[PDB]
């Protein structure tokens, strides 16, 4: 029962993180605070009946959904080069996760580079 961890900074850690959320999105307004995560099945027998947020959409999920790896991280769609679709169920649950995302997305135009000649 030596050195103790005492949580008197729990209420101030609650606000420190709230202000960090406030500081972050204020820097990147139009875009959401967080990325979209996929929906994945937990890897056990106690938990395979539930759905939970994944780490990102695999290469094939984005390929069928219509975004390539390079343009999918710009618009905020994390990729997961580890995860892979072993069954058509997970493919369809996450392909139509990006479908609703790409419908609700307003990609603002950037600045182009136009050389004087061709």
């Amino acid at each position: 029962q030596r050195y103790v961890k005492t949580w008197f900074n729990q209420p101030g850690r609650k606000l420190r993180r709230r202000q960090a959320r406030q500081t972050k999105a204020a820097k990147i307004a139009p875009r959401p605070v967080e990325a979209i995560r996929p929906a994945v099945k937990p890897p056990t027998i106690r938990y395979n009946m539930k759905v939970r947020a994944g780490r990102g959409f695999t290469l094939e999920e984005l390929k069928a959904a219509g975004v390539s790896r390079r343009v999918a991280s710009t618009i905020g769609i994390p990729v997961d080069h580890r995860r892979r679709n072993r069954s058509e169920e997970s493919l369809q649950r996450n392909v139509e996760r990006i479908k609703v995302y790409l419908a609700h997305l307003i990609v603002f135009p950037r600045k182009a580079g136009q050389p004087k000649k061709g």
């Binding site: 406030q22 204020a26 990147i28 307004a29 967080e34 947020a53 307003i106 135009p109 000649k117 061709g118």
Partner: protein, 140 residues
């Protein structure tokens, strides 16, 4: 207590008083001008996002929501406006290319893009057929 903090307790030099604390350090918004006008410097960020019609997060909220009782259109028209102003992605041909494709088309007809590619003298750069059409359509 430490000698260091006893130094400026028994010293005569005034401190470096730095006035920083602000209750409710709600950070004001920069970035997009549209949102910066229609921000509420009092309400919270998740209220403001839902007020404007912007999804704060696409993923489920890991706690409670706020139940007190039992801009998006502007962003859309602004978006399609800029896409219209910066739309002419077509590029002309430089004077070199203007001659480069003309000499190829003046001698291999106009549609035999496989023949021009096989040419060894006029097609010095060894441009593939896909780029030859690209330079063709770019001329018009």
């Amino acid at each position: 207590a430490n000698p260091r903090q006893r130094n400026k307790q028994r010293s005569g030099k005034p401190r470096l008083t730095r006035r920083n604390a602000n209750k409710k350090a709600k950070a004001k918004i920069y970035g997009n001008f549209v949102i910066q006008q229609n921000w509420d410097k009092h309400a919270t960020l998740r209220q403001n996002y839902a007020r404007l019609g912007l999804l704060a997060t696409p993923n489920y909220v890991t706690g409670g929501v706020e139940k007190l009782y039992p801009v998006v259109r502007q962003l859309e028209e602004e978006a399609v406006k800029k896409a219209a102003r910066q739309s002419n992605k077509m590029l002309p041909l430089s004077a070199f290319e203007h001659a480069y494709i003309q000499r190829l088309i003046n001698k291999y007809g106009t549609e035999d893009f496989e023949s021009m590619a096989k040419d060894v003298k006029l097609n010095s750069k060894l441009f593939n057929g896909s780029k030859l059409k690209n330079l063709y359509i770019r001329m018009k």
